[PDB]
Amino acid sequence: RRRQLIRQLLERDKTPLAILFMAAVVGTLVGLAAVAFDKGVAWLQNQRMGALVHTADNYPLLLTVAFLCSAVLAMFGYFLVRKYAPEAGGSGIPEIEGALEDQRPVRWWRVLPVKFFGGLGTLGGGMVLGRAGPTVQIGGNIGRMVLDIFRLKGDEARHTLLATGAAAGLAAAFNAPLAGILFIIEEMRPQFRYTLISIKAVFIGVIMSTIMYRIFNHEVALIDVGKLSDAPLNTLWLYLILGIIFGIFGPIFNKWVLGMQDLLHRVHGGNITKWVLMGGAIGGLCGLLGFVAPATSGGGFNLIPIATAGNFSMGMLVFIFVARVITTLLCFSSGAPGGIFAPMLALGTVLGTAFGMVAVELFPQYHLEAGTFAIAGMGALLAASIRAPLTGIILVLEMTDNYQLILPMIITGLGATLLAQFTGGKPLYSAILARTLAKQEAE
Amino acid sequence: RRQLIRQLLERDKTPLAILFMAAVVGTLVGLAAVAFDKGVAWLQNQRMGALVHTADNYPLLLTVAFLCSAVLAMFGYFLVRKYAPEAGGSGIPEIEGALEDQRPVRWWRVLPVKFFGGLGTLGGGMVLGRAGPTVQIGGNIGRMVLDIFRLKGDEARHTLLATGAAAGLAAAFNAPLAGILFIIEEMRPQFRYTLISIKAVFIGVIMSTIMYRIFNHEVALIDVGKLSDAPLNTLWLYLILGIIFGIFGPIFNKWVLGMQDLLHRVHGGNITKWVLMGGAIGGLCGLLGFVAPATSGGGFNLIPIATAGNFSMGMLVFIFVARVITTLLCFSSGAPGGIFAPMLALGTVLGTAFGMVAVELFPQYHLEAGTFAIAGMGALLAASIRAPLTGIILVLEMTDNYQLILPMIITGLGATLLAQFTGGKPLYSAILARTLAKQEA
């Protein structure tokens, strides 16, 4: 096989020009799509606030239109999914991961409108879910749809345009081009066998998608955290410890998200009406919590900078964490359309901050800032639950821009995946695809 | 499918032994890399102390500048031709070979040969990088602990070989991410599946980078400061720069391949003509290092100067041509030492030059030529080596101008795209191939 190689080596990186051009269009569409999804979710969350001001004096009335506004929008999303596209429940990352294995179908005529409007409801209602998976799935299907429409043939083309769709999808979700590309090559792609996914092509898709996002979202960042202090070498060991803490918690949280899926399934048994009704209840609880304790509901992105800047009491941190584990499991294990990836950012940030707090008072000799531990911990649940640490590290780097924390960030991340492995946890997206692949065969 | 469902549930369970051994490969490669660096530094330094000893007799000082580097050059050419031939050139093609199981890892030979051979060519002030050298050194370190501890299994051989190479590039650049990414973008077997644990490569990279930090803290290889942002309406200029690197990339690849040939005629294969030719090149370098330092040595020094726009357009044109010349002479000659890092200086300079023209052609854009230097730094890496993701992430790690990620990605993609379209090939793949084919003939 020496002679195959010499041939192969000299034929390396020659992606079919058609696949390259089509990547640019998948990128561009996924971009606009993602922008639209974001402005959408924003607007509805905003009307819901304008409605609370309409009734800003009658507290029990305002506690109700806060519930109902989100309850209704929740249901409309649960409904759109149970009725027209069931694969558009949950993240959408397990699903597109499935697709890349050729083990799940890409019914883009159904999921594009279902995910987009269904997500617009759950997210726009202020549920604890991310544009995370949603735009990843949306993007993959966009990729499928141009593959169909232009009738491009070949495995490479199917796998590539599916991959650049998902990567451009995560890029536009976070303004994170590198994190997008990396997610595909670390996690999204078929893990156990070779594939023909052009990286150069994924790159071109990611560029266009990120440029679209920039046309519409320039001048503002999803997280601004400022420039924090450096991390002394003698301070590193504290990050390995935080890594271990995430590493044992990671798997535990994975159990709860899987188990809660089960327990919530009993509430409806499979029935579109019990389900949708259960959805509006969860959704309603969220829109209510969004008024009476906003840090326990919604995306979580708002409280990330507040946590990092150390502006939360230790109590508030403990509160926000427990309350958010609770409402994250309720929202995601329920099957509503929308991911768990992004609410794990807020979860990690909070847990990390808390550790920085204790680290600071235990060692004034180190001149610590709890905010460096928030930043190490931001991608740490991503590392211990999803087991994509390289993506979490690079994502957080793209979002927070504190490169001088790369060593603590890597160390905590590795520490998370290592203790997540060693204590018996599994990659959550892999464990969800598997549950769903083994259910397809179970019946 | 039921295969997948069984596999999915068994995912990311690297054998604890492979994990622990990664930590030790990382730690050794680290110390090794640090030692190689302090070494190269010291010799370059003595050579300067020798020029001060004779600081009045210009034709004498032009001689001990030649000879000091000439001798050290030869000693390196010699150590390679005599004891380990696979330790000529970069060392990346070679470890890439190894990962395909198509080249051998004779660590008992190459560790000392690369390390002291490189110590001579680099420390003599030749135009080569610790680039490949520490990557090869690192892979062999990885091999050597694999042997020593007799770990069995393909995964263990491929992994510990990979973490060695990644920890090696990490330590060479203080670039942990760029290290890991180089393995998954370029170093690993490109055409088939393999069992290289990423988590394990990560652990090796951490330890290696930490070692480098114990000894090199408080200073950065490149400081460039925080440059301006890039307006959306300014992006198209970066796609143009990418195109320019994209057509040049392949041309430069031809020259590095061809010059290998032409320089081989000078010696025919003969250890004495070769080593003697080496000391001549090495001597020319150590001379240029005194009479025009920007045309010789690593190149890292002139990167910040270029980015800050402190070079005339003339000087930029000079430094570029002069450096194409002395890079081909130094690397195509077979001396131990990479082309990866001198391509950084080459791209930076070319980039700056473009920024210069961009600035005066469009004062409406409020440009700073230094943003084009930074987009262009990893652009030869993208158009010649065809590892743009590693180039982009490496430069980001070294220059810390994240607000330039879009221009940097755009120029990079623009490089690989026109490099492909104009018929160039990955230089490390073209060199490994050159060598796997002169082998079965």
PDB file of C-alpha atoms in Angstrom, chain A residues 52-295:
ATOM      1  CA  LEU A  52     -45.845  43.074  30.909  1.00  0.00           C
ATOM      2  CA  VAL A  53     -45.594  46.872  30.849  1.00  0.00           C
ATOM      3  CA  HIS A  54     -49.174  47.060  29.496  1.00  0.00           C
ATOM      4  CA  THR A  55     -50.264  45.450  32.773  1.00  0.00           C
ATOM      5  CA  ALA A  56     -47.457  46.747  35.028  1.00  0.00           C
ATOM      6  CA  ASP A  57     -49.651  47.422  38.108  1.00  0.00           C
ATOM      7  CA  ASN A  58     -51.779  44.302  38.625  1.00  0.00           C
ATOM      8  CA  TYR A  59     -49.070  41.888  39.768  1.00  0.00           C
ATOM      9  CA  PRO A  60     -51.248  38.741  39.693  1.00  0.00           C
ATOM     10  CA  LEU A  61     -52.434  39.738  36.199  1.00  0.00           C
ATOM     11  CA  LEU A  62     -48.897  40.483  35.025  1.00  0.00           C
ATOM     12  CA  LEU A  63     -47.740  37.184  36.535  1.00  0.00           C
ATOM     13  CA  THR A  64     -50.330  35.638  34.250  1.00  0.00           C
ATOM     14  CA  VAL A  65     -49.726  37.251  30.853  1.00  0.00           C
ATOM     15  CA  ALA A  66     -46.089  36.430  31.576  1.00  0.00           C
ATOM     16  CA  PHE A  67     -47.099  32.777  31.981  1.00  0.00           C
ATOM     17  CA  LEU A  68     -49.582  32.653  29.093  1.00  0.00           C
ATOM     18  CA  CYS A  69     -47.458  34.487  26.516  1.00  0.00           C
ATOM     19  CA  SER A  70     -44.708  31.913  26.926  1.00  0.00           C
ATOM     20  CA  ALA A  71     -47.124  29.042  27.509  1.00  0.00           C
ATOM     21  CA  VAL A  72     -48.800  29.667  24.161  1.00  0.00           C
ATOM     22  CA  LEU A  73     -45.537  30.086  22.222  1.00  0.00           C
ATOM     23  CA  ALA A  74     -44.145  26.957  23.905  1.00  0.00           C
ATOM     24  CA  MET A  75     -47.129  24.833  22.813  1.00  0.00           C
ATOM     25  CA  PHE A  76     -47.005  26.180  19.263  1.00  0.00           C
ATOM     26  CA  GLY A  77     -43.434  24.839  19.158  1.00  0.00           C
ATOM     27  CA  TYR A  78     -44.093  21.485  20.789  1.00  0.00           C
ATOM     28  CA  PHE A  79     -46.984  21.199  18.362  1.00  0.00           C
ATOM     29  CA  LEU A  80     -45.057  22.063  15.168  1.00  0.00           C
ATOM     30  CA  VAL A  81     -42.601  19.289  16.097  1.00  0.00           C
ATOM     31  CA  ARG A  82     -44.922  16.507  17.166  1.00  0.00           C
ATOM     32  CA  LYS A  83     -47.205  17.103  14.179  1.00  0.00           C
ATOM     33  CA  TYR A  84     -44.870  17.695  11.218  1.00  0.00           C
ATOM     34  CA  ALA A  85     -41.258  16.789  12.113  1.00  0.00           C
ATOM     35  CA  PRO A  86     -40.406  14.774  15.234  1.00  0.00           C
ATOM     36  CA  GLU A  87     -36.662  14.728  14.484  1.00  0.00           C
ATOM     37  CA  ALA A  88     -36.806  18.472  15.101  1.00  0.00           C
ATOM     38  CA  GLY A  89     -37.266  18.004  18.821  1.00  0.00           C
ATOM     39  CA  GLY A  90     -34.307  18.537  21.175  1.00  0.00           C
ATOM     40  CA  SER A  91     -30.889  19.783  20.064  1.00  0.00           C
ATOM     41  CA  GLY A  92     -30.696  18.751  16.423  1.00  0.00           C
ATOM     42  CA  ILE A  93     -27.046  17.932  16.764  1.00  0.00           C
ATOM     43  CA  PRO A  94     -27.669  14.245  17.478  1.00  0.00           C
ATOM     44  CA  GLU A  95     -29.859  14.214  14.379  1.00  0.00           C
ATOM     45  CA  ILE A  96     -27.353  15.842  11.949  1.00  0.00           C
ATOM     46  CA  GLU A  97     -24.718  13.630  13.542  1.00  0.00           C
ATOM     47  CA  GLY A  98     -27.007  10.719  12.612  1.00  0.00           C
ATOM     48  CA  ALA A  99     -27.297  12.062   9.054  1.00  0.00           C
ATOM     49  CA  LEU A 100     -23.513  12.135   8.708  1.00  0.00           C
ATOM     50  CA  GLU A 101     -23.513   8.402   9.479  1.00  0.00           C
ATOM     51  CA  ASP A 102     -26.279   7.917   6.890  1.00  0.00           C
ATOM     52  CA  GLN A 103     -28.450   6.559   9.655  1.00  0.00           C
ATOM     53  CA  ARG A 104     -31.000   9.361   9.894  1.00  0.00           C
ATOM     54  CA  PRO A 105     -32.839  11.218   7.186  1.00  0.00           C
ATOM     55  CA  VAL A 106     -32.641  14.899   6.249  1.00  0.00           C
ATOM     56  CA  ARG A 107     -36.288  15.809   5.551  1.00  0.00           C
ATOM     57  CA  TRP A 108     -35.533  19.433   4.865  1.00  0.00           C
ATOM     58  CA  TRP A 109     -38.939  20.220   3.378  1.00  0.00           C
ATOM     59  CA  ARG A 110     -40.288  19.503   6.884  1.00  0.00           C
ATOM     60  CA  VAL A 111     -37.643  20.405   9.439  1.00  0.00           C
ATOM     61  CA  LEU A 112     -36.538  23.788   8.064  1.00  0.00           C
ATOM     62  CA  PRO A 113     -39.958  25.285   8.730  1.00  0.00           C
ATOM     63  CA  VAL A 114     -40.564  23.142  11.850  1.00  0.00           C
ATOM     64  CA  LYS A 115     -37.240  23.880  13.642  1.00  0.00           C
ATOM     65  CA  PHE A 116     -37.211  27.552  12.674  1.00  0.00           C
ATOM     66  CA  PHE A 117     -40.811  28.385  13.778  1.00  0.00           C
ATOM     67  CA  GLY A 118     -40.932  25.771  16.518  1.00  0.00           C
ATOM     68  CA  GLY A 119     -37.672  27.076  17.964  1.00  0.00           C
ATOM     69  CA  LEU A 120     -38.884  30.640  17.473  1.00  0.00           C
ATOM     70  CA  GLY A 121     -41.587  29.674  19.913  1.00  0.00           C
ATOM     71  CA  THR A 122     -39.704  27.872  22.633  1.00  0.00           C
ATOM     72  CA  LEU A 123     -36.769  30.307  22.557  1.00  0.00           C
ATOM     73  CA  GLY A 124     -38.870  33.400  21.904  1.00  0.00           C
ATOM     74  CA  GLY A 125     -41.074  32.345  24.813  1.00  0.00           C
ATOM     75  CA  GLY A 126     -38.002  32.558  27.002  1.00  0.00           C
ATOM     76  CA  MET A 127     -37.402  28.893  27.654  1.00  0.00           C
ATOM     77  CA  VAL A 128     -34.014  27.656  28.820  1.00  0.00           C
ATOM     78  CA  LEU A 129     -32.704  26.450  25.427  1.00  0.00           C
ATOM     79  CA  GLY A 130     -30.099  27.580  22.868  1.00  0.00           C
ATOM     80  CA  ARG A 131     -29.978  28.520  19.162  1.00  0.00           C
ATOM     81  CA  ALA A 132     -27.157  26.037  19.590  1.00  0.00           C
ATOM     82  CA  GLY A 133     -28.447  22.851  17.936  1.00  0.00           C
ATOM     83  CA  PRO A 134     -31.406  24.568  16.214  1.00  0.00           C
ATOM     84  CA  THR A 135     -29.225  26.495  13.774  1.00  0.00           C
ATOM     85  CA  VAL A 136     -26.866  23.512  13.449  1.00  0.00           C
ATOM     86  CA  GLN A 137     -29.787  21.307  12.361  1.00  0.00           C
ATOM     87  CA  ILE A 138     -31.317  24.085  10.281  1.00  0.00           C
ATOM     88  CA  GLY A 139     -27.954  24.597   8.581  1.00  0.00           C
ATOM     89  CA  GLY A 140     -27.438  20.909   7.813  1.00  0.00           C
ATOM     90  CA  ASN A 141     -30.863  20.719   6.221  1.00  0.00           C
ATOM     91  CA  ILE A 142     -30.118  23.859   4.230  1.00  0.00           C
ATOM     92  CA  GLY A 143     -27.054  21.976   3.078  1.00  0.00           C
ATOM     93  CA  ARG A 144     -29.157  18.941   2.169  1.00  0.00           C
ATOM     94  CA  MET A 145     -31.678  21.075   0.328  1.00  0.00           C
ATOM     95  CA  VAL A 146     -29.099  22.675  -1.986  1.00  0.00           C
ATOM     96  CA  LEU A 147     -27.636  19.202  -2.548  1.00  0.00           C
ATOM     97  CA  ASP A 148     -31.037  18.015  -3.700  1.00  0.00           C
ATOM     98  CA  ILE A 149     -32.017  21.155  -5.643  1.00  0.00           C
ATOM     99  CA  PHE A 150     -28.736  21.100  -7.607  1.00  0.00           C
ATOM    100  CA  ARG A 151     -28.636  17.285  -7.758  1.00  0.00           C
ATOM    101  CA  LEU A 152     -24.962  16.943  -6.841  1.00  0.00           C
ATOM    102  CA  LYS A 153     -23.928  13.321  -6.726  1.00  0.00           C
ATOM    103  CA  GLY A 154     -21.228  11.546  -4.768  1.00  0.00           C
ATOM    104  CA  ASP A 155     -20.728  10.689  -1.100  1.00  0.00           C
ATOM    105  CA  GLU A 156     -18.188  13.516  -0.651  1.00  0.00           C
ATOM    106  CA  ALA A 157     -20.767  16.070  -1.779  1.00  0.00           C
ATOM    107  CA  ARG A 158     -23.480  14.721   0.541  1.00  0.00           C
ATOM    108  CA  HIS A 159     -21.208  14.503   3.532  1.00  0.00           C
ATOM    109  CA  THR A 160     -19.417  17.777   2.878  1.00  0.00           C
ATOM    110  CA  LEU A 161     -22.475  19.980   2.190  1.00  0.00           C
ATOM    111  CA  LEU A 162     -24.102  18.407   5.219  1.00  0.00           C
ATOM    112  CA  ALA A 163     -21.028  19.209   7.309  1.00  0.00           C
ATOM    113  CA  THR A 164     -20.511  22.778   6.044  1.00  0.00           C
ATOM    114  CA  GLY A 165     -24.181  23.353   6.762  1.00  0.00           C
ATOM    115  CA  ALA A 166     -23.778  22.372  10.385  1.00  0.00           C
ATOM    116  CA  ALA A 167     -20.494  24.221  10.823  1.00  0.00           C
ATOM    117  CA  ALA A 168     -21.749  27.421   9.204  1.00  0.00           C
ATOM    118  CA  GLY A 169     -24.721  26.918  11.495  1.00  0.00           C
ATOM    119  CA  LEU A 170     -22.790  26.944  14.754  1.00  0.00           C
ATOM    120  CA  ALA A 171     -20.490  29.690  13.503  1.00  0.00           C
ATOM    121  CA  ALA A 172     -23.433  32.003  12.876  1.00  0.00           C
ATOM    122  CA  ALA A 173     -24.946  31.046  16.240  1.00  0.00           C
ATOM    123  CA  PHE A 174     -21.975  32.270  18.233  1.00  0.00           C
ATOM    124  CA  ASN A 175     -20.008  34.509  15.830  1.00  0.00           C
ATOM    125  CA  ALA A 176     -17.451  31.743  16.211  1.00  0.00           C
ATOM    126  CA  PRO A 177     -15.988  30.671  12.816  1.00  0.00           C
ATOM    127  CA  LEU A 178     -13.162  28.511  14.284  1.00  0.00           C
ATOM    128  CA  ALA A 179     -15.450  26.881  16.818  1.00  0.00           C
ATOM    129  CA  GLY A 180     -17.783  26.002  13.982  1.00  0.00           C
ATOM    130  CA  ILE A 181     -15.186  24.299  11.789  1.00  0.00           C
ATOM    131  CA  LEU A 182     -13.670  22.571  14.828  1.00  0.00           C
ATOM    132  CA  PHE A 183     -17.014  21.172  16.027  1.00  0.00           C
ATOM    133  CA  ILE A 184     -17.358  19.296  12.742  1.00  0.00           C
ATOM    134  CA  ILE A 185     -13.822  17.816  12.891  1.00  0.00           C
ATOM    135  CA  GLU A 186     -13.872  17.002  16.619  1.00  0.00           C
ATOM    136  CA  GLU A 187     -17.429  15.862  17.164  1.00  0.00           C
ATOM    137  CA  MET A 188     -19.933  16.146  14.320  1.00  0.00           C
ATOM    138  CA  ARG A 189     -18.170  13.920  11.771  1.00  0.00           C
ATOM    139  CA  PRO A 190     -18.388  10.061  11.735  1.00  0.00           C
ATOM    140  CA  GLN A 191     -16.219   9.117  14.665  1.00  0.00           C
ATOM    141  CA  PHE A 192     -15.423   5.490  13.898  1.00  0.00           C
ATOM    142  CA  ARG A 193     -14.578   5.440  10.213  1.00  0.00           C
ATOM    143  CA  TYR A 194     -13.024   7.442   7.419  1.00  0.00           C
ATOM    144  CA  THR A 195     -15.106  10.018   5.477  1.00  0.00           C
ATOM    145  CA  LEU A 196     -14.694  12.408   2.565  1.00  0.00           C
ATOM    146  CA  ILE A 197     -15.506  15.780   4.131  1.00  0.00           C
ATOM    147  CA  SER A 198     -13.492  18.559   2.546  1.00  0.00           C
ATOM    148  CA  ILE A 199     -12.201  20.888   5.290  1.00  0.00           C
ATOM    149  CA  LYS A 200     -11.474  23.604   2.765  1.00  0.00           C
ATOM    150  CA  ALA A 201     -15.133  23.479   1.767  1.00  0.00           C
ATOM    151  CA  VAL A 202     -16.437  23.622   5.342  1.00  0.00           C
ATOM    152  CA  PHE A 203     -14.167  26.621   5.751  1.00  0.00           C
ATOM    153  CA  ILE A 204     -15.725  28.457   2.802  1.00  0.00           C
ATOM    154  CA  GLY A 205     -19.199  27.815   4.184  1.00  0.00           C
ATOM    155  CA  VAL A 206     -18.207  29.052   7.612  1.00  0.00           C
ATOM    156  CA  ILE A 207     -16.729  32.262   6.198  1.00  0.00           C
ATOM    157  CA  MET A 208     -19.887  33.173   4.273  1.00  0.00           C
ATOM    158  CA  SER A 209     -22.109  32.330   7.214  1.00  0.00           C
ATOM    159  CA  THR A 210     -20.038  34.423   9.608  1.00  0.00           C
ATOM    160  CA  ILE A 211     -19.893  37.296   7.150  1.00  0.00           C
ATOM    161  CA  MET A 212     -23.740  37.238   6.902  1.00  0.00           C
ATOM    162  CA  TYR A 213     -23.947  37.351  10.695  1.00  0.00           C
ATOM    163  CA  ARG A 214     -21.522  40.288  10.599  1.00  0.00           C
ATOM    164  CA  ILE A 215     -23.609  42.248   8.096  1.00  0.00           C
ATOM    165  CA  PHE A 216     -26.477  42.219  10.580  1.00  0.00           C
ATOM    166  CA  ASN A 217     -24.887  41.981  14.007  1.00  0.00           C
ATOM    167  CA  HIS A 218     -21.748  44.071  13.783  1.00  0.00           C
ATOM    168  CA  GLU A 219     -20.600  46.416  16.575  1.00  0.00           C
ATOM    169  CA  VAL A 220     -21.991  44.206  19.386  1.00  0.00           C
ATOM    170  CA  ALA A 221     -20.718  40.974  21.002  1.00  0.00           C
ATOM    171  CA  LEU A 222     -22.788  38.220  22.610  1.00  0.00           C
ATOM    172  CA  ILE A 223     -20.449  38.218  25.560  1.00  0.00           C
ATOM    173  CA  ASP A 224     -18.174  41.043  26.618  1.00  0.00           C
ATOM    174  CA  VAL A 225     -16.068  40.183  29.596  1.00  0.00           C
ATOM    175  CA  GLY A 226     -13.154  42.562  29.157  1.00  0.00           C
ATOM    176  CA  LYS A 227      -9.506  41.673  29.614  1.00  0.00           C
ATOM    177  CA  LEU A 228      -8.998  39.737  32.841  1.00  0.00           C
ATOM    178  CA  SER A 229      -5.778  39.077  34.756  1.00  0.00           C
ATOM    179  CA  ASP A 230      -3.151  36.494  33.777  1.00  0.00           C
ATOM    180  CA  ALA A 231      -2.643  33.152  35.446  1.00  0.00           C
ATOM    181  CA  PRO A 232       0.605  32.542  37.317  1.00  0.00           C
ATOM    182  CA  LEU A 233       2.223  29.116  36.737  1.00  0.00           C
ATOM    183  CA  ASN A 234       1.894  28.424  40.474  1.00  0.00           C
ATOM    184  CA  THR A 235      -1.832  28.992  40.078  1.00  0.00           C
ATOM    185  CA  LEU A 236      -2.455  26.350  37.377  1.00  0.00           C
ATOM    186  CA  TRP A 237      -3.076  23.426  39.757  1.00  0.00           C
ATOM    187  CA  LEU A 238      -6.303  25.130  40.884  1.00  0.00           C
ATOM    188  CA  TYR A 239      -7.609  24.816  37.304  1.00  0.00           C
ATOM    189  CA  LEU A 240      -6.877  21.050  37.195  1.00  0.00           C
ATOM    190  CA  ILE A 241      -8.969  20.793  40.374  1.00  0.00           C
ATOM    191  CA  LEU A 242     -11.864  22.682  38.766  1.00  0.00           C
ATOM    192  CA  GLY A 243     -11.485  20.351  35.804  1.00  0.00           C
ATOM    193  CA  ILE A 244     -11.876  17.375  38.105  1.00  0.00           C
ATOM    194  CA  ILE A 245     -15.001  18.895  39.678  1.00  0.00           C
ATOM    195  CA  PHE A 246     -16.596  19.365  36.234  1.00  0.00           C
ATOM    196  CA  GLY A 247     -15.352  15.899  35.328  1.00  0.00           C
ATOM    197  CA  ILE A 248     -17.367  14.157  38.027  1.00  0.00           C
ATOM    198  CA  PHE A 249     -20.394  16.403  37.627  1.00  0.00           C
ATOM    199  CA  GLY A 250     -20.471  16.133  33.815  1.00  0.00           C
ATOM    200  CA  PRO A 251     -21.641  12.475  33.719  1.00  0.00           C
ATOM    201  CA  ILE A 252     -24.094  13.023  36.602  1.00  0.00           C
ATOM    202  CA  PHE A 253     -25.746  15.821  34.625  1.00  0.00           C
ATOM    203  CA  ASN A 254     -25.797  13.524  31.566  1.00  0.00           C
ATOM    204  CA  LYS A 255     -27.745  10.927  33.560  1.00  0.00           C
ATOM    205  CA  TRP A 256     -30.302  13.506  34.600  1.00  0.00           C
ATOM    206  CA  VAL A 257     -30.814  14.812  31.071  1.00  0.00           C
ATOM    207  CA  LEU A 258     -31.325  11.228  29.803  1.00  0.00           C
ATOM    208  CA  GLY A 259     -33.458  10.101  32.747  1.00  0.00           C
ATOM    209  CA  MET A 260     -35.583  13.254  32.765  1.00  0.00           C
ATOM    210  CA  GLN A 261     -36.308  12.570  29.118  1.00  0.00           C
ATOM    211  CA  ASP A 262     -37.828   9.297  30.267  1.00  0.00           C
ATOM    212  CA  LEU A 263     -39.721  10.666  33.256  1.00  0.00           C
ATOM    213  CA  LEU A 264     -41.193  13.475  31.147  1.00  0.00           C
ATOM    214  CA  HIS A 265     -42.237  10.977  28.506  1.00  0.00           C
ATOM    215  CA  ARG A 266     -44.475   9.245  31.013  1.00  0.00           C
ATOM    216  CA  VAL A 267     -46.385  12.515  31.487  1.00  0.00           C
ATOM    217  CA  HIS A 268     -47.696  12.277  27.915  1.00  0.00           C
ATOM    218  CA  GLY A 269     -47.005   8.688  26.810  1.00  0.00           C
ATOM    219  CA  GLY A 270     -46.376   9.890  23.266  1.00  0.00           C
ATOM    220  CA  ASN A 271     -49.632  11.772  22.938  1.00  0.00           C
ATOM    221  CA  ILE A 272     -49.513  15.043  20.982  1.00  0.00           C
ATOM    222  CA  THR A 273     -52.001  16.727  23.311  1.00  0.00           C
ATOM    223  CA  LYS A 274     -50.690  15.811  26.739  1.00  0.00           C
ATOM    224  CA  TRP A 275     -47.273  16.648  25.304  1.00  0.00           C
ATOM    225  CA  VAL A 276     -48.108  20.072  23.862  1.00  0.00           C
ATOM    226  CA  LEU A 277     -50.053  20.886  27.016  1.00  0.00           C
ATOM    227  CA  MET A 278     -47.088  19.837  29.152  1.00  0.00           C
ATOM    228  CA  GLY A 279     -44.954  22.046  26.934  1.00  0.00           C
ATOM    229  CA  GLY A 280     -47.027  25.160  27.516  1.00  0.00           C
ATOM    230  CA  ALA A 281     -46.768  24.488  31.240  1.00  0.00           C
ATOM    231  CA  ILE A 282     -42.979  24.329  31.157  1.00  0.00           C
ATOM    232  CA  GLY A 283     -42.883  27.236  28.723  1.00  0.00           C
ATOM    233  CA  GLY A 284     -45.265  29.132  30.974  1.00  0.00           C
ATOM    234  CA  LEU A 285     -43.123  28.489  34.036  1.00  0.00           C
ATOM    235  CA  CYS A 286     -40.173  29.887  32.097  1.00  0.00           C
ATOM    236  CA  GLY A 287     -41.878  33.097  30.968  1.00  0.00           C
ATOM    237  CA  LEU A 288     -42.962  33.545  34.578  1.00  0.00           C
ATOM    238  CA  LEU A 289     -39.477  32.914  35.997  1.00  0.00           C
ATOM    239  CA  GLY A 290     -38.273  35.338  33.324  1.00  0.00           C
ATOM    240  CA  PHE A 291     -40.057  38.048  35.259  1.00  0.00           C
ATOM    241  CA  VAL A 292     -39.761  36.917  38.872  1.00  0.00           C
ATOM    242  CA  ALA A 293     -36.171  35.567  38.753  1.00  0.00           C
ATOM    243  CA  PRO A 294     -34.743  36.165  35.261  1.00  0.00           C
ATOM    244  CA  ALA A 295     -31.409  34.450  35.971  1.00  0.00           C
TER     245      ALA A 295
END
